[PDB]
Design a protein around this ligand. Sequence first.
Ligand SMILES: *[C@@H]1O[C@H](CO)[C@@H](O)[C@H](O)[C@H]1NC(C)=O
Lengths: 48, 49
Amino acid sequence: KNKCVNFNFNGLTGTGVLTESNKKFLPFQQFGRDIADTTDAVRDPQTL
Amino acid sequence: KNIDGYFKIYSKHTPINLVRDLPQGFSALEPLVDLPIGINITRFQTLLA
Ligand SMILES: *[C@@H]1O[C@H](CO)[C@@H](O)[C@H](O)[C@H]1NC(C)=O
């Protein structure tokens, strides 16, 4: 966390800084998105 | 609803004071389960007790 890394989470390949988000996702809701429609946040499939 | 062999169900349960018909208000429906049944469904029934 708090570092620039290349991450592939649940088949989703991306590069960015991983931080803990204060947003509360529903159990089913996973991928968050901003106005730009790019992925804002994801969920760790191993340890949720 | 069923699309592309994948069934989708959306469940919301909240208490309300109602007599008949439907109350006028807003509600946000959320999913319930995930059922990849993949079968043709042309009819449905409502079970009662
Ligand atoms: C489902 O079966 C009914 C009756 O045979 C048919 O009219 C309908 O087109 C079928 N739908 C699909 C998606 O195959």
